[PDB]
Amino acid sequence: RIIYYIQAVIPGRAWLIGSNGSTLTVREGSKIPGYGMVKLIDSLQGRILTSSGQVIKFSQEDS
Amino acid sequence: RIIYYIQAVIPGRAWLIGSNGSTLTVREGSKIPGYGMVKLIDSLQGRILTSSGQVIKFSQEDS
Amino acid sequence: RIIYYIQAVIPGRAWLIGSNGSTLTVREGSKIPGYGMVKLIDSLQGRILTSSGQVIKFSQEDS
Amino acid sequence: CVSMIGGSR
Amino acid sequence: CVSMIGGSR
Amino acid sequence: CVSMIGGSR
Amino acid sequence: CVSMIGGSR
Amino acid sequence: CTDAALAALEYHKSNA
Amino acid sequence: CTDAALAALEYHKSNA
Amino acid sequence: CTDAALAALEYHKSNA
Amino acid sequence: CTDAALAALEYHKSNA
Amino acid sequence: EVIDKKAFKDMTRNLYPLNPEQVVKLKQIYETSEYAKAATPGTPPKPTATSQFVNLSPGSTPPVIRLSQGFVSSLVFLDSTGAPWPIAAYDLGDPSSFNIQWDKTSNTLMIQATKLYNYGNLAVRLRGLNTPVMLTLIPGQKAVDYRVDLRVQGYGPNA
Amino acid sequence: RVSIGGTVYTAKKYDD
Amino acid sequence: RVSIGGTVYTAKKYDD
Amino acid sequence: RVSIGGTVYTAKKYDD
Amino acid sequence: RVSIGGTVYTAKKYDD
Amino acid sequence: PFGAD
Amino acid sequence: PFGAD
Amino acid sequence: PFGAD
Amino acid sequence: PFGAD
Amino acid sequence: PFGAD
Amino acid sequence: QQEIQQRTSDMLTAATQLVQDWKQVETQVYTEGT
Amino acid sequence: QQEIQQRTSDMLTAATQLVQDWKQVETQVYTEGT
Amino acid sequence: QQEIQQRTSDMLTAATQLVQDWKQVETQVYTEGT
C-alpha cells in the first residue's frame, strides 16, 4: 500500500507527503485513503491518529 | 440527481456550487431544485438543512 | 393574467416589474391591472397586499 | 399613511 | 432571521 | 476543535 | 524532552 | 403582522 | 445545535 | 496525553 | 550521572 | 530550597498569567465577537446582474437601480443594437449617499451606497442622445443590483 | 404608530 | 438568538 | 480545554 | 529537570 | 418589526 | 456556539 | 503539555 | 393632521 | 552540572 | 418626578441631532465628459 | 477576597495586550523584478 | 515571610529582560558580490 508521512502540522490543518509524491491537507474530519477517516491531529507532537488505528508520523528522515 | 456542495456561507446568504459547475445562492427560505426548499443556513457549521432531509455542506475536497 | 414582482420597496412607493417587462411604481392607494387596488405595502418584509387577495412578493430568482 | 417600522404586534 | 452566533444549546 | 496546547493530563 | 543543563545529580 | 398594520390604518382613516 | 435554532425560528414566526 | 484529547473531544461533541 | 537524566526521561514519558 | 519552588510558581502565574488555555479562550472569544460585529442583519441582498429596457417616452417610468451599503454597482448604457454608449456627462443628486466613479471616456458608471437606505437619482447625458437618461437608485433593498444593462431606447454612435 | 398628521394612531392588539 | 426587528425571542432548552 | 465558540468543556482525568 | 510541556519532571537521586 | 420577515 | 462545529 | 512529546 | 391623507 | 564532563 | 426631566433632556439632545440631520441637503454635483 | 480583583487588573492588562496584537494586520509587499 | 515577595521581585526584573531578549529577532543581511 501507500504510506503517507507528515509534511507539517499546525492546530487544525496538517499537510502530508507520501511515497507517490502526492501532497494532501487534512482537518479534524476527513476521508484519507486507506487509513479511513482521521480521528485527530496532535500538532505539538506531530501525530495523526485515524480510524483504522494507523498512526501518521513525520518520516524518520525529515523529523 | 445533481449534487451541490457549499461554496461559501455567511449569516443569511450562502453561495452553492453543484456537480454540473453551476453556481447559485440561497437564503432562509428559497427553492432549491431536487432538495425542495431550505429551512436553515448554519453559517458557523457550514450546514444547510432542506426539506427532503439533505444537508448541504462544503465539498469534501473544498472543506 | 400578468404576474408582477417587486424590484424595490420603501415606505410608500413600491417599484414593480411585470412578466412582460412593463415597469410601474405604486403608493398606498393605486390601480394595478389584474391585481385590483393596493391595500397595504410592507416594505420591511417586501410584501404588498392588494384587494384581490393577491400578495405581491419578490420573485424567487431575485429574492 | 402607515410607517410599519413603528410596528407593534 | 436567525443569527446562529447568538446561539445557546 | 481541540486546542491541544490547551492540554492537561 | 530533557534539558539536562537543568540537571542535578 | 399585517393585522396590526391594517387595523391602525383603518383607525387613522376613520378618525380625522 | 440546530434544534435550538429551529425551535427559536418557529417561535419567532409564530410571534410576530 | 491523547486519551484526554479523545475524552474532551467526545464530551464536546456530546454537549452542544 | 546519566542514570538521573534517563530516569527523569522515563518518568516524564510515563506521566503525560 | 522550596522557596524557589513556590516563588517560581507565583512567577509562572503572573509574568505569563494567561494560561495556554486562557490564551486560546481569549482568541476564540475575539473570533466570536468579531463574527458578531461582522454578521449582516437578516438575509443580505441578492447580488444580481440584470438588464432593463430604458423607455424615454413621456409617461414612461424611470428605471430603478437597487444598491447595497458599500458595494459597487456598475451601470452600463446600451443602444438598441447591442453596442455600448459612451457618456457625455452626468449629474448626481445627494452625493453623500452615493459615491460615483467613472473614467471620463467609457460607458461605465460605478456607484457605491455611501449610506444605507436613503434613495436618490442620477441624470446621465449620453453622447448622441439629447434627453438625459435620468434614473432612480434605492440602496438597502433585499437585493443588490451588481450591474444593470440599461438598453436605452435610442441608437448609439456604434451600429 | 404615528401618522403624517403627527397625531398618533395605533392598533390595540393584533397577531399573525 | 435575535431577529432584525428588535424584539428578543429565544428557545428554552434544546440539545443535540 | 476550550473550543472556538466560547464554552469550556474539559476531560476529568486521563493519563497515557 | 523541566520538560517542553512546561510541567516539571525531576529524578529523585542518581549518581555515577 | 414583525414575524413575517 | 454549537457542538457540531 | 503531554508526556509523549 | 387630517384623516384622509 | 554533570560529573562526566 | 425627576426621571421625567432626565429622559426629556437626554432625548432633546438626541432630537436636535436628528433634526439637523434633516436640514442638511448637500449640493448635487455635475461631472462632465472628456 | 481582593486577590481576584488584583489578578483582575493583571489579567485584563494582559488580555487587551493580546487582542490589539491580534487586530494587527500588516499590509502586503511586492518586489517587482528588474 | 517577606523573602518570597522580595526574591520574586528580583525574578520579575530578571525574567522580563530575558523574555525581551528572546522576543528579539534581527534581520538577516544579503551581501552582493562585485
DSSP per residue, L43-111: SPP-EEEEEEEE--STTPPPPEEEE-BT-EEEEEEE-TTS-B--EEEEEEESTTTEEEE--TTSSEEEE
On whether the CB atoms of residues O3 and F1 are closer than 8 A, the answer is yes
How far apart are the C-alpha atoms of M2 and T5, rounded to whole Å? 13
How far apart are the C-alpha atoms of P6 and Q5, rounded to whole Å? 54
On whether the CB atoms of residues S2 and A44 are closer than 8 A, the answer is yes
Q: Residue L110 corresponds to which cell in the numbers above?
A: 460605478
Length of chain T: 5
How far apart are the C-alpha atoms of B13 and W11, rounded to whole Å? 38
Q: Resolution in angstroms, to 1 decimal, for this deposition?
A: 4.6
Give the distance between the most distant pair of CA atoms in chain A: 28
Q: What dihedral do alpha carbons C58, E4, L47, I16 form, nearest 10°?
A: 20
Distance of CA B28 to CAs L43, L130, Q4, Å? 7, 46, 12
How far apart are the C-alpha atoms of B48 and B27, rounded to whole Å? 10
Provide the 8-state DSSP code for H6: H
B and L touch with 3+ CB pairs <8 Å, answer: yes
Q: Residue B35 corresponds to which cell in the numbers above?
A: 432538495
How far from each other are the two terminal CA atoms of chain R, in whole angstroms? 8
List of residues 6+ apart from H12 with CB closer than 8 A: D1, D2, M1, M3, M9, T3
Beta bridge partners of A5: A17
On whether the CB atoms of residues B49 and I9 are closer than 8 A, the answer is no
Task: Identify the three-state secondary structure at position A60.
Answer: coil
Picking from G6, M6, A51, L65, the residue whose alpha carbon sits closest to that of residue U2 is G6
Picking from O2, L145, A58, L129, the residue whose alpha carbon sits closest to that of residue F1 is O2
Method used to determine the 3D structure: cryo-EM
How far from each other are the two terminal CA atoms of chain J, in whole angstroms? 24
Chain K residue with the nearest C-alpha to that of S2: K16
Q: What is the CA radius of gyration of chain C?
A: 10
Subunits with at least 3 CB pairs below 8 A relative to chain R? B, E, I, J, N, O
Amino acid of residue H11 = Y
On whether the CB atoms of residues A34 and A51 are closer than 8 A, the answer is no
Distance of CA A23 to CAs A4, A16, A36, A57, I12, Å? 9, 5, 17, 15, 48
A26, with CB counted inside 10 A (0-12, 13-18, 19+), is: buried
Beta bridge partners of C17: C5, C23
Would strands B4-9 and A55-57 be described as parallel, antiparallel, or unpaired?
Answer: unpaired
Residue B2's CB is within 10 A of a number of other CB atoms, namely 10
Find cell 456607484 and name the residue: L111
Beta bridge partners of A24: A16
Task: Identify the three-state secondary structure at position B58.
Answer: strand
Q: After which residues is chain O broken (C to N over 2.5 A)?
A: none
Please give, rounded to a whole number of angstroms, the shortest distance from the CA of A6 to a CA of chain B.
19
On whether the CB atoms of residues L108 and L147 are closer than 8 A, the answer is no
On whether the CB atoms of residues P9 and P3 are closer than 8 A, the answer is yes
Q: Residue L135 corresponds to which cell in the numbers above?
A: 434614473
Picking from A30, A26, A31, the residue whose alpha carbon sits closest to that of residue A9 is A26
A24 CB near a chain B CB, below 8 Å?
no
How far apart are the C-alpha atoms of A13 and E9, rounded to whole Å? 27
Picking from W5, X5, W10, W17, the residue whose alpha carbon sits closest to that of residue L14 is W10
Amino acid of residue W34 = T
On whether the CB atoms of residues C18 and C6 are closer than 8 A, the answer is no
For residue W1, the Cα-to-chain-centroid distance in whole angstroms is 29
On whether the CB atoms of residues P13 and K5 are closer than 8 A, the answer is no
Beta bridge partners of A47: A42, A57
L143 CB near a chain C CB, below 8 Å?
yes
Amino acid of residue B58 = F
Q: What dihedral do alpha carbons B34, B36, B41, B46 form, nearest 10°?
A: -20
On whether the CB atoms of residues L6 and L14 are closer than 8 A, the answer is no
On whether the CB atoms of residues A26 and A35 are closer than 8 A, the answer is no
F1 vs A42: CB contact, 8 Å cut-off?
A: no
How far apart are the C-alpha atoms of H13 and H7, rounded to whole Å? 10
Amino acid of residue D1 = C
In a mutagenesis test of the C interface, which of D1, D2, D5, D9 is the best target, namely the one with the most C β-carbons within 10 Å? D2
Subunits with at least 3 CB pairs below 8 A relative to chain S? A, F, J, K, O, P
Beta bridge partners of L90: L124, V31
What angle do the packed helices W3-22 and L20-36 form, to 10 degrees? 60
On whether the CB atoms of residues A50 and A39 are closer than 8 A, the answer is yes
Q: Residue U3 corresponds to which cell in the numbers above?
A: 560529573
Instruction: Please report which helix (H) or strand (E) contains residue C13, including its range.
Output: none
